[PDB]
Amino acid sequence: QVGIGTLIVFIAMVLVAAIAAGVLINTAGYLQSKGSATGEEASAQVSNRINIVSAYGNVXXXXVDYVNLTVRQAAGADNINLXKSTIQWIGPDXATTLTYXXXXXXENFTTXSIKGXXXXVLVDQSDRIKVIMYAXXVXXXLXXGXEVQLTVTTQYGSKTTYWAQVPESLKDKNAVXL
Amino acid sequence: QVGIGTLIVFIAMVLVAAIAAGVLINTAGYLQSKGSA
Amino acid sequence: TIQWIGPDXATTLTYXXXXXXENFTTXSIKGXXXXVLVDQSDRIK
Ligand SMILES: *[C@@H]1O[C@H](CO)[C@@H](O[C@@H]2O[C@H](C(=O)O)[C@@H](O)[C@H](O)[C@H]2O)[C@H](O)[C@H]1O
Ligand SMILES: *[C@@H]1O[C@H](CO)[C@@H](O[C@@H]2O[C@H](C(=O)O)[C@@H](O)[C@H](O)[C@H]2O)[C@H](O)[C@H]1O
Ligand SMILES: *[C@@H]1O[C@H](CO)[C@@H](O[C@@H]2O[C@H](C(=O)O)[C@@H](O)[C@H](O)[C@H]2O)[C@H](O)[C@H]1O
Numbered sequence: 001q002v003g004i005g006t007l008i009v010f011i012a013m014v015l016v017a018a019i020a021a022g023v024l025i026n027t028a029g030y031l032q033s034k035g036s037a038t039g040e041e042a043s044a045q046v047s048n049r050i051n052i053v054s055a056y057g058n059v060x061x062x063x064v065d066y067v068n069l070t071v072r073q074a075a076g077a078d079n080i081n082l083x084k085s086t087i088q089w090i091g092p093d094x095a096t097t098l099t100y101x102x103x104x105x106x107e108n109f110t111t112x113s114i115k116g117x118x119x120x121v122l123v124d125q126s127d128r129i130k131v132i133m134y135a136x137x138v139x140x141x142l143x144x145g146x147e148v149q150l151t152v153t154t155q156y157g158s159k160t161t162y163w164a165q166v167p168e169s170l171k172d173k174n175a176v177x178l
Numbered sequence: 179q180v181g182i183g184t185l186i187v188f189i190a191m192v193l194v195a196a197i198a199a200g201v202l203i204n205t206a207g208y209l210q211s212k213g214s215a
Numbered sequence: 216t217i218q219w220i221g222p223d224x225a226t227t228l229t230y231x232x233x234x235x236x237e238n239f240t241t242x243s244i245k246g247x248x249x250x251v252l253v254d255q256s257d258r259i260k
Contacts, residue, residue: 035185035188035189038192039192042196045199046200053218056220114227163211
């Protein structure tokens with residue numbers, strides 16, 4: 001009688017242990033996948049960043065109408081994608097967030113390739129892509145002295161602030177280095 | 179259950195480093211523009 | 216890449232192999248490679 005009851009408690013012990021173990025491994029599996037998720041995401045948050053080589057601007061009449069940004073990968077970065085980035089434009093007048101535009105822009109920005117295959121994705125360290133924003137389509141065409149705070153933000157999370165400072169004089173200067 | 183506690187703390191250590199990691203870079207970003215000007 | 220900011224045009228120059236147009240070409244002055252700086256004494260024009 002006692003032995004029969006022990007076996008019933010035994011098999012119930014087996015099932016309870018299996019469920020407890022099953023919960024343990026399944027929770028471990030969830031945290032393993034979650035734990036793996038942050039390792040790549042946080043490293044891409046830290047490593048993957050935009051690096052701005054230069055910032056020039058076209059000058060028509062007497063005001064800067066196009067703003068040109070040449071960008072590249074950071075040190076030891078993965079594939080930065082410039083079509084999933086959102087540049088922030090805090091200008092002298094307006095203050096909006098620029099999204100990427102195809103073809104084109106207006107309140108959006110376009111990316112033309114300078115060196116490399118892709119014209120929107122930085123694959124290797126040597127690829128350079130030019131970021132195009134219409135200054136006369138986001139606000140008034142930038143005149144002399146105007147300053148723009150440009151915050152390029154990667155998809156994974158990065159910040160490359162560049163204070164595009166228009167030169168104090170545009171006297172007979174077709175293109176100027178902001 | 180010792181491994182489960184490790185995993186949650188593992189995740190916490192990752193963001194805490196990531197939170198700390200940002201501050202130097204974004205501060206260096208502000209000073210890189212301030213120094214250049 | 217060489218960023219040319221001249222009185223008129225203002226573009227970024229890539230590399231070619233002809234003397235070019237909107238590119239630049241490199242001719243070795245002192246050394247083996249005509250495109251790669253390997254030693255401290257290498258000069259390429
Ligand atoms: C930033 O890059 C833009 C890439 O399209 C340049 O765009 C061209 O500018 C020319 C001129 O205004 O300089 C126009 O004739 C082209 O149609 C226009 O695509 C822009 O000039 C430059 O600042
Ligand atoms: C860079 O980011 C782009 C953001 O739109 C990606 O764009 C998509 O790419 C898909 C495919 O992988 O080619 C297309 O089916 C989508 O229509 C296109 O928007 C791009 O892939 C990525 O490299
Ligand atoms: C020489 O000094 C002038 C002082 O008035 C400047 O003139 C102003 O320039 C502004 C801008 O910087 O382009 C315009 O918005 C003003 O309307 C204009 O009077 C001039 O620019 C400067 O070179």
